[model samples]
Target: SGSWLRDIWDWICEVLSDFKTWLKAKLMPQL
Candidate 1:
């Protein structure tokens, strides 16, 4: 049970990290 929760947490972090980089690149063109 605990292991599955950690896996989900890790996946969320990975997506957020990727989105952070993607958002910066997208905003750079506008700014």
Candidate 2:
């Protein structure tokens, strides 16, 4: 029902946070 939209948004936030941490780790060694 309406819970579907909330699920999608939560997935996006989780993915974004993971990506952010990954990118930082990738760049940290070069800095």
Clashes of each: 0, 0
TM-score of 2: 0.51
**TM-score, predicted candidate 1 vs. hidden true structure:** 0.48
lDDT of 2 by residue, 1-31 (tens): 7788788999999999989888888776752
| Candidate 1 lDDT tens digits, 1-31 | 5588788999999999988888787777763
Estimated TM-score for each candidate: 0.48, 0.51
lDDT of 2: 0.85
Candidate 2: residue 29 lDDT (0-100): 70
Error of 2 at 18 (Å): 1.2
